Scaffold this active site. Structure first.
Site, PDB file in Angstrom:
ATOM      1  N   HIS B 135      42.315  37.823  37.190  1.00 45.73           N
ATOM      2  CA  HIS B 135      41.159  37.084  36.698  1.00 45.73           C
ATOM      3  C   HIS B 135      40.977  37.142  35.191  1.00 45.73           C
ATOM      4  CE1 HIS B 135      39.500  35.310  40.173  1.00 45.73           C
ATOM      5  NE2 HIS B 135      39.047  36.407  40.750  1.00 45.73           N
TER       6      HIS B 135
HETATM    7 ZN   LIG Z   1      39.840  37.776  45.151  1.00 47.28          ZN
END
Ligand SMILES: [Zn+2]
Ligand SMILES: [Zn+2]
Ligand SMILES: [Zn+2]
Ligand SMILES: [Zn+2]
Ligand SMILES: [Zn+2]
Lengths: 182, 368, 506, 316, 20
Positions: B135
C-alpha cells in the site's frame, strides 16, 4: 456600488472557484501572461485612441494604481487556503535569491479578475467620495469590457492531464496534505 | 515437480506490535512459523535469515526524506515531526510504534534476498511472509504499510528477468504496486479486489495503464461474499490468459489473508482450500516463484492458511490434525487445519463476471 | 426508411424526457462537437437493446489514450525528488507522473466498512487479549534468553530489549537501568523471570476463560443468514410476497403460461411433513378435537388426491388442472416451501452422515487436557441416528415444546456447518400451514371450489370442455376482483406448473 | 522493586490478577519443536546491492493547529498568514495580528487623519484614486478569498459547502421492496434488460439488483450497466442516457453553459431553422449566454445533411 | 412530413445524377 461584471467573466470566476476548492488544483506559476503584461497591453492598446489629456492620463493613473493594489493585496485577500502553500514556496525560493517578491510579475489575468470582484466590497469600507467612486467603477467597467473582448487569449480551456501548458496544475497528495491538514 | 524452496524468517519479526486495538499484528507470522516447524517442513526446506535492508536499498523506490523520517520517528518525539506526519500520512491509520524502522527493514531485506536467490538460481520458490506490504507508494504510508518491499523485490527481479508478473489476491486493490509500475511494460500487475465504497477506492475495470504500459494492468472488481467456486472460476481463466499472452519470466504472488472467511476487515467468503487453490494453480506453471504474505487480520485463520500454502508449495498435502504447536489455544473448537466458510450471501453473478472477463480479455488482446 | 426510423426510435424509447436527451446528443454531434465513437456509444446505450434499428444505423452512417478514472497527472516540476538508490533501470521502470491517493478516488466521502455481528466482536476481543498476553510474554522471554546468554558469558534487534525493560520498569528508572546495563545484569534477569512466571500463570487462567467463552460463540459467528432468518421469514412469507413474485415473473414473461415450475423428486418427504403436521395438530391448544380430526383428515385426503400417492401407505409409514383462489395458492406455496427445505436437507444426507461419523479427534491436547461435551451431554450430537431422521426427531421435539430453540439451532449449526439454517422456523411454518388448511376448510367459497376440484379430479376422464366449465364454475364462486391460479399437474413425473391468471379469464 | 507496573491491560485488569470472577460467571458453562531454527538459519546476504484563541482559524474559518495572539482573541493558521510562518522557524516573540498591531502601536484616534492625508499626498503624485485603499489594506488582517455573494447567486445550481467549497447539483439480505415503485406499486423495469427480475424468497440467487438513476429516475440493473456496487456516499449517480456536457474534441475542449437565474436568462429563436452554427446550448420546443431554441423538426434535417455530406466527401 | 419525402427523393435523384 453597482459593478456590471459580464456573465462570461462571472462564469470564469466560478469555474476557478470550482477548480481550486473542489478539484484541488493550483495556478501554474509563474503565469505565461502576468498581470503586468495584460495591463500593459490594455494601456498600450487603449490610450493610443484617446486624445483628451485628462482621459489619457487618468488611464495610466488607474493602471498604476491597480498594479500597486494587486501587489499589496494578493498575499492578503486574493488566495484560497489551498494556494497558500504555493505562496509560501514562492516566498522561500525568492528569499533564497535575495529577490523581493513581485506578485504582479508572477500571477496573471485570473487573480486580477478576482481582484476586481470585491472592489465594490472594498470601497464600501472607506471614506471615498461619491464623485470618484463613479470614476473608479466606470474605469473598472471599461477594463472589464476590454477583457471580455480579449477573453480567448487569457482564459483557455486546457486539461492538466493532457497538456503541461495548461493554466492549472494538479496538486500532489503531499502538497494537499500539507496545505489543508497542518 | 518438487522444486527447491527457500524460506526466510527473522525470529524477531513477531516482537513488533501496532496499537492495542490495531487489526494488524506481525505476531501472526510467528504462529505461522510454528505450524511450519511442528509439521516437520524444515526437513523439506532451507531456512534463511535475510539480512535487513539499508536506507539506500529502500531509497530505490522511496524518497530520501521519507526514509529519513521513518528511521528517526519514535513515539517519544512525534511532536517534533508535525509537518512530516501530515505530509507522509504517518498519523492514526498507520501509527508509529517502537520498532517501525526495524520491522520495515526486516520485511524489505526478506523480499530482496528472496528475489536475489531467485536471480542466482539457488531456488525456484522463495517464501517471505513478513512482506506483502503493498500500500505504501514512494512517499507515504497507506493501509498499515510503510515500505513497499514488493516494489524492491520486483526491481531486483527485473535485473535478471525481462518481464515480471505480480498477482494480488488480497481483498484490497494493490494500489502501491500498480502505481509504481503503471507506466512500464515490464511489470504486469493483476489484482483481484473488492471494489465499491471500499478502502482502496481505486482499481476500476478501466485502469489498464498509461503510455507504454497501456493494457499492462489488470483489475478484477468483485462483490462481497464470493465463494471458492466463483473465485476459482474467475481466477483461473484470467491467470491462464495472462500467462499465455504475456509470458512472464518470474511471478510474485501476494497471499493476503483478507480473502478468508471471518476476517476482521475483509468481506470475502473464501475457505483455506479456496485460498490455497490460487497458489497451487499458479505454481503449476513452472516459472520462478516468489510468495509473500500481505493482508489478514484473523490471526489463527491466516496462520493456518499460510502453513497450508507452504505445505502445498513443498508438494505435500498436510493432515487436518494439529501437531501441538506452542500457540495451541488459538485454534479454538476442534484444532483442525481448516477455515470454515460462512453461509453469507454471494452477490457476484455469472452475467457480471462474464462482462468483466470479456472486458479483461479485450484489454489483454494487445499484450502479445 | 429514415423518418420511419425516427418514429420507431421515438416509440421504442417511450419517454419524452429521454427522447429530449437523445435529440440533444444528436444535435451535439450535428454541430461538429461530438465524434463518431461517443455518438455510437450513446446510441448503443439508447437503442442498442434492439438489433434491427441499431445495426441499420451502424451500416448506414458508415461507422464500419484511455485514461483511467482514478489517476491524476502531476507537473514535471513536482516529480524529481532525491532518490539515492534509484539506478538507471530503477529510473526507467518506475512511474512518477500519475498518483492515486484514495482520498481523491473516494470523492472525499470515505468508505463503508463491513457489518459484523456481536459474536464476531466477542471473538475479536478474545483475540486481542490473547495477542496482548502472547506479545508481552514472548518479548520478555527473548530478553530473558539474551540476558541468560550474557550472564553465562560473564562468569569470568536493538530496541526489543529496551522496550521490554521499559515495560517492566515503570517508575521512570528504566532509562537509568538500561544505561547501567550498557556499561548489574543478574538483578534484571531475575526480575524478568519473576514477571514471566506471573504473566504465564495469568495467561493459563485467562486461556481457560477464553476457551470456555469461545466454545459458546464461535459457531454463531458464521451464522450470517441464520441469525436474521426468523424475522426475515416472518416478513417475507406472506401472501403479498408470493403474489408479487408470481406477478413479477408474469410481467417479465409478457415483455418478450409456465410462470412457476416445481419438481418433486421424492415421495417420502410428504410423510415427514404429515408427521410434523399431525404432531402440531395434536399439540396445539387452539382447535377442538373434532376440528383437529377434521384438519388431519383434510390434509391426508388432499395430499392423497393431489399427488395420487396412496390412501393406506400414508397412514402406515393424464394431466390434471386445479383452478384455485388466493387461499388455495398460499396453502400450496406453504406446502412447497416446507417440501423444498426438507428436500434440501435430505439431498446431502450421506455426506453429512459421513462427516459426523468420521469426525476425528486430536489426541495431542483435546482428549488429554480439554474435553468439551456440552452438546454431547444433551444427546444433540448426531452420533449414529442418520442426520435426516435425527433432524426430524428434533423438529418433533421443538414442536412438542421440550426442546428449546437455542439448542435446536446450535445442534443444526454444529451438525451441518451452518448449511441448514432454513429449518429454524419449521414449527412456525407448520403452524401457518395448519392455519391455512383450516381457513381453506372454514370458508364457504374455498370449500365449494375444492368440492368442484374433487369432482373434476375424480372424474379423471374428461373432454376439452371441462377446462371451460370448471373455470366458469370456479368463476361462479370467485368475485370480480380476486385472482385465479391454474395449478397444472403431471402425475407421470410428479411435476407442478403454476400460471397466474389475475383477471384474464373474464 | 516497582509497584506501579500493574497499570491496566485490554482485559481491564493489571495483567497479574486473573479471570475476573465476574467474567468467569459471564463466560463459562457452569516434527520436533521450534527450538531448532536458530541452528538451521543460514544467513543469506547474496543481494546484488550488498556492496552499496477560538477553535476556528480567523482567516479560512476551519480547524487545525493555531497561532493565537495574546491581546486579540483571533487564532490563525500558519499558511493562513501573511507571510506564512514555518512552525520550525518560530519568531519566539510578542506576536500580534495586523489589526492588533495597528490598534496597539499606531492607535492615534485623534490624529489618524493626519497619517491618512500624509499617505494621500504621498500617493497624489502618481496614484490618488487608490491611495485610500493602499492605506486601508494595512489596517486589515489576512483573509481567504471568497466570491462576494453576487457572483455565486447568478447561477442557481451552485452552492457553498461546509468549509466554503464549491457544490453543485451533483453533490448528493434479500430485499424485494427495492423493485417496487414505492410510489405507485408498479415494478421497476430495467431499461436495458426490460425485466425486473425480482427473484424469490425461496431462491434469492435469481434476483438482480436495480438502481433507479437519480436524474431521470430510469431504473437500471447493476449487472446491465457494468457496476460493482451502488452509490451511497459519492456524487449522485448519473445513468448513461444523459448528454455529456463535456466533450474533448480532437486537443480541444467543449463545455455546456452553466444555468443562469431566470431573470437574466435571455431566450431567442432563429428565423432560419435550416442550418445554424450554434453550440450545445439549446432548448427543445449580455448576448453571450443565450439559450437557442432548436425546433426539433429542424434537427431531423440538420443531422441528416451532415451525414449525407459525410457520405459524399468520403465517397470521393 | 410529406414535403420531407419530396425533398429526400429530389435530393437523392440529384446525387445519382451527379454520379451518372
Ligand atoms: Zn488487504
Ligand atoms: Zn486557516
Ligand atoms: Zn491581534
Ligand atoms: Zn437490467
Ligand atoms: Zn438518468
Amino acid at each position: 456600488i453597482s459593478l456590471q461584471i459580464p456573465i462570461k467573466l462571472k462564469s470564469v470566476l466560478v469555474d476557478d472557484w470550482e477548480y481550486v476548492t473542489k478539484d484541488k488544483k493550483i495556478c501554474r506559476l509563474p503565469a505565461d501572461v502576468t498581470v503586468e503584461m495584460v495591463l500593459n497591453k490594455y494601456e498600450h492598446e487603449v490610450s493610443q485612441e484617446l486624445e483628451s489629456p485628462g482621459s489619457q492620463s487618468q488611464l495610466s493613473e488607474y493602471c498604476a494604481g491597480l498594479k500597486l493594489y494587486f501587489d499589496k493585496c494578493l498575499g492578503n485577500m486574493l488566495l484560497y487556503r489551498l494556494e497558500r502553500l504555493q505562496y509560501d514556496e514562492l516566498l522561500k525560493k525568492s528569499s533564497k535569491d535575495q529577490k523581493p517578491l513581485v506578485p504582479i510579475r508572477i500571477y496573471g489575468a485570473i487573480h486580477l479578475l478576482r481582484l476586481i470582484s470585491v472592489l465594490p466590497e472594498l470601497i464600501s469600507s472607506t471614506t471615498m467620495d461619491l464623485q470618484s467612486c463613479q470614476l473608479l467603477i466606470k474605469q473598472t467597467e471599461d477594463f472589464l469590457v476590454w477583457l471580455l473582448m480579449h477573453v480567448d487569449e487569457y482564459f483557455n480551456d486546457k486539461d492538466p492531464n493532457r497538456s503541461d501548458d495548461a493554466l492549472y496544475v494538479n496538486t500532489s497528495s503531499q502538497y494537499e496534505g500539507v496545505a489543508l491538514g497542518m | 515437480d518438487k522444486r527447491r524452496v527457500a524460506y526466510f524468517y527473522d525470529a524477531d519479526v513477531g516482537n513488533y506490535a501496532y496499537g492495542a486495538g490495531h487489526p494488524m499484528k506481525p505476531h501472526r507470522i510467528r504462529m505461522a512459523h510454528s505450524l511450519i516447524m511442528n509439521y516437520g517442513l524444515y526437513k523439506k526446506m532451507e531456512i534463511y535469515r535475510a539480512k535487513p535492508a539499508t536506507k539506500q536499498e529502500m531509497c530505490q523506490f522511496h524518497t530520501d526524506e521519507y526514509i529519513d523520517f521513518l528511521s528517526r520517528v519514535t513515539p517519544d518525539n512525534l511532536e517534533m515531526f508535525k509537518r512530516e506526519s501530515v505530509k507522509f500520512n504517518v498519523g492514526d491509520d498507520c501509527p508509529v510504534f517502537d520498532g517501525l524502522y526495524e520491522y520495515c527493514s526486516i520485511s524489505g531485506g526478506g523480499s530482496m534476498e528472496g528475489a536475489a536467490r531467485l536471480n542466482r538460481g539457488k531456488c525456484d520458490v522463495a517464501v517471505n511472509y513478513a512482506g506483502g506490504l503493498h500500500h505504501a507508494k514512494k512517499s507515504e504510508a497507506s493501509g498499515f504499510c510503510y515500505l513497499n518491499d514488493i516494489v524492491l523485490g520486483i526491481i531486483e527481479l527485473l535485473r535478471y528477468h525481462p518481464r515480471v508478473l505480480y498477482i494480488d489476491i488480497d481483498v484490497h486493490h494493490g494500489d502501491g504496486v500498480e502505481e509504481a509500475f503503471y507506466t512500464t511494460d515490464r511489470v504486469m500487475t493483476c489484482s483481484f479486489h473488492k471494489y465499491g465504497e471500499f478502502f482502496p477506492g481505486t482499481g476500476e475495470l478501466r485502469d489498464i495503464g498509461v503510455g507504454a504500459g497501456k493494457n499492462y494492468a489488470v483489475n478484477v472488481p468483485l462483490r462481497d461474499g464470493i465463494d471458492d467456486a466463483t473465485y476459482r472460476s474467475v481466477f483461473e481463466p484470467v491467470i491462464k490468459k495472462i500467462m499465455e499472452w504475456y509470458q512472464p519470466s518470474a511471478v510474485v504472488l501476494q497471499c493476503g489473508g483478507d480473502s478468508l472467511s471471518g476476517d476482521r476487515l475483509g468481506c470475502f467468503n473464501l475457505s483455506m482450500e479456496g485460498h490455497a487453490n490460487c497458489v497451487n494453480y499458479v505454481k503449476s506453471f513452472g516459472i520462478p516463484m516468489m510468495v509473500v504474505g500481505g493482508g489478514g487480520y484473523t490471526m489463527r485463520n491466516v496462520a493456518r492458511t499460510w502453513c497450508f500454502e507452504t505445505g502445498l508449495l513443498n508438494n505435500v498435502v498436510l493432515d487436518k490434525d494439529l501437531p501441538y504447536n506452542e500457540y495451541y489455544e488459538y485454534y479454538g473448537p476442534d484444532y483442525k487445519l481448516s477455515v470454515r466458510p460462512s453461509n453469507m450471501f454471494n452477490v457476484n453473478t455469472p452475467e457480471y463476471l462474464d462482462k468483466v472477463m470479456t472486458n479483461i480479455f479485450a484489454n489483454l488482446e494487445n499484450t502479445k | 426508411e429514415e423518418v420511419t426510423f425516427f418514429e420507431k426510435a421515438k416509440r421504442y424509447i417511450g419517454n419524452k424526457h429521454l427522447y429530449t436527451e437523445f435529440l440533444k446528443i444528436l444535435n451535439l454531434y450535428s454541430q461538429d462537437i461530438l465524434d463518431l465513437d461517443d455518438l455510437v456509444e450513446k446510441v448503443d446505450f439508447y437503442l442498442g437493446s434492439n438489433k434491427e434499428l441499431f445495426t441499420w444505423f451502424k451500416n448506414f452512417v458508415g461507422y464500419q489514450e484511455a485514461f483511467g478514472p482514478s489517476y491524476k497527472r502531476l507537473p514535471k516540476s513536482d516529480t524529481f525528488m532525491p532518490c539515492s538508490g534509484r539506478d538507471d533501470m530503477c529510473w526507467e521502470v518506475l512511474n512518477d507522473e500519475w498518483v492515486g491517493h484514495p482520498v481523491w478516488a473516494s470523492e472525499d466521502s470515505g468508505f463503508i466498512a463491513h457489518r459484523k455481528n456481536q459474536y464476531e466482536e466477542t471473538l475479536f476481543k478474545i483475540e486481542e487479549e490473547r495477542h496482548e498476553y502472547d506479545f508481552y510474554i514472548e518479548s520478555n522471554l527473548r530478553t530473558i534468553q539474551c540476558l541468560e546468554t550474557i550472564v553465562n558469558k560473564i562468569e569470568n534487534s536493538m530496541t526489543i530489549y529496551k522496550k521490554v525493560i521499559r515495560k517492566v520498569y515503570d517508575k521512570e528508572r528504566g532509562f537509568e537501568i538500561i544505561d547501567a546495563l550498557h556499561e548489574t545484569a543478574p538483578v534484571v534477569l531475575k526480575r524478568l523471570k519473576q514477571k514471566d512466571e506471573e504473566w504465564r500463570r495469568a495467561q493459563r487462567e485467562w486461556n481457560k476463560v477464553w476457551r470456555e467463552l469461545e466454545q459458546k460463540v464461535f459457531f454463531k459467528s458464521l451464522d450470517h443468514l441464520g441469525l436474521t432468518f426468523k424475522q426475515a421469514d416472518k416478513k417475507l412469507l406472506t401472501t403479498k410476497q408470493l403474489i408479487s413474485e408470481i406477478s413479477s415473473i408474469k410481467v417479465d414473461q409478457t415483455n418478450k403460461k409456465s410462470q412457476l415450475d416445481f419438481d418433486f423428486p421424492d415421495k417420502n418427504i410428504f410423510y415427514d411433513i404429515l408427521c410434523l403436521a399431525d404432531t402440531f395438530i395434536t399439540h396445539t391448544t387452539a382447535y377442538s378435537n373434532p376440528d383437529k380430526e377434521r384438519l388431519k383428515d383434510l390434509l391426508k385426503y388432499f395430499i392423497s388426491l393431489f399427488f395420487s400417492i396412496s390412501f393406506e401407505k400414508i397412514e402406515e409409514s393424464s394431466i390434471f388442472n386445479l383452478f384455485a383462489n388466493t387461499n388455495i395458492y398460499i396453502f400450496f406455496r406453504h406446502w412447497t416451501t416446507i417440501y423444498e427445505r426438507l428436500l434440501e436437507i435430505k439431498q446431502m444426507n450421506e455426506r453429512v452422515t459421513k462427516e459426523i461419523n468420521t469426525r476425528s479427534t486430536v489426541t495431542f491436547a483435546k482428549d488429554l487436557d480439554l474435553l468439551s461435551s456440552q452438546l454431547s451431554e444433551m444427546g444433540l450430537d448426531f452420533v449414529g441416528e442418520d442426520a435426516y431422521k435425527q433432524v426430524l426427531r428434533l423438529s418433533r421435539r421443538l414442536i412438542n415444546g421440550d426442546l428449546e430453540h437455542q439448542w435446536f439451532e446450535e445442534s443444526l449449526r454444529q451438525a451441518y456447518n451452518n448449511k441448514a439454517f432454513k429449518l429454524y422456523t419449521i414449527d412456525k411454518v407448520t403452524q401457518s400451514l395448519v392455519k391455512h388448511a383450516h381457513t381453506l376448510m372454514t370458508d364457504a367459497k374455498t370449500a365449494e371450489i375444492m368440492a368442484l376440484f374433487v369432482k373434476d379430479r375424480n372424474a379423471s376422464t374428461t373432454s376439452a370442455k371441462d377446462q371451460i366449465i370448471y373455470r366458469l364454475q370456479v368463476r361462479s364462486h370467485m368475485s370480480n376482483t380476486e385472482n385465479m391460479f391454474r395449478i397444472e399437474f403431471d402425475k407421470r413425473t410428479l411435476h407442478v406448473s403454476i400460471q397466474y391468471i389475475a383477471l384474464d379469464d373474464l | 522493586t516497582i509497584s506501579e507496573d500493574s497499570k491496566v491491560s485490554v482485559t481491564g485488569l493489571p495483567l497479574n490478577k486473573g479471570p475476573s470472577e465476574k467474567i468467569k460467571r459471564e463466560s463459562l458453562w457452569n516434527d520436533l519443536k521450534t527450538f531448532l531454527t536458530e541452528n538451521m538459519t543460514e544467513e543469506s546476504n547474496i543481494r546484488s546491492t550488498i556492496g552499496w484563541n477560538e477553535d476556528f482559524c480567523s482567516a479560512c474559518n476551519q480547524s487545525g493547529s493555531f497561532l493565537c495572539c495574546d491581546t486579540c482573541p483571533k487564532s490563525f493558521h500558519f499558511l493562513c498568514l501573511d507571510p506564512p510562518i514555518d512552525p520550525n522557524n518560530l519568531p519566539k516573540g510578542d506576536w500580534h495580528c495586523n489589526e492588533c498591531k495597528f490598534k496597539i502601536f499606531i492607535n492615534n484616534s485623534m490624529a489618524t487623519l493626519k497619517k491618512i492625508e500624509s499617505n494621500f499626498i504621498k500617493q497624489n503624485n502618481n496614484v490618488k484614486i487608490f491611495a485610500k485603499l493602499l492605506f486601508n489594506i494595512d489596517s486589515h488582517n489576512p483573509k481567504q478569498f471568497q466570491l462576494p455573494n453576487y457572483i455565486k447567486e447568478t447561477f442557481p445550481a451552485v452552492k457553498t459547502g461546509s468549509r466554503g467549497q464549491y457544490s453543485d447539483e451533483n453533490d448528493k439480505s434479500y430485499n424485494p421492496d427495492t423493485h417496487i415503485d414505492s410510489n405507485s406499486g408498479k415494478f421497476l423495469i430495467c431499461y436495458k434488460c426490460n425485466q425486473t427480475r425480482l427473484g424469490s424468497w425461496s431462491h434469492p440467487e435469481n434476483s438482480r439488483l436495480i438502481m433507479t438513476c437519480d436524474y431521470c429516475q430510469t431504473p437500471w440493473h447493476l449487472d446491465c450497466v457494468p457496476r460493482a456496487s451502488f452509490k451511497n456516499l459519492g456524487s449522485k449517480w448519473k445513468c448513461p442516457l444523459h448528454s455529456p456536457t463535456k466533450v474533448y474534441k480532437k486537443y480541444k475542449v467543449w463545455k455546456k453553459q452553466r444555468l443562469i437565474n431566470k431573470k437574466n436568462q435571455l431566450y431567442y429563436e432563429p428565423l432560419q431553422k435550416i442550418g445554424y452554427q450554434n453550440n450545445g446550448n439549446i432548448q427543445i420546443i449580455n448576448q453571450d449566454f443565450k439559450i437557442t431554441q432548436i425546433d426539433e423538426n429542424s434537427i431531423k434535417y440538420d443531422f441528416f445533411d451532415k451525414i449525407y455530406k459525410s457520405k459524399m466527401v468520403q465517397k470521393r
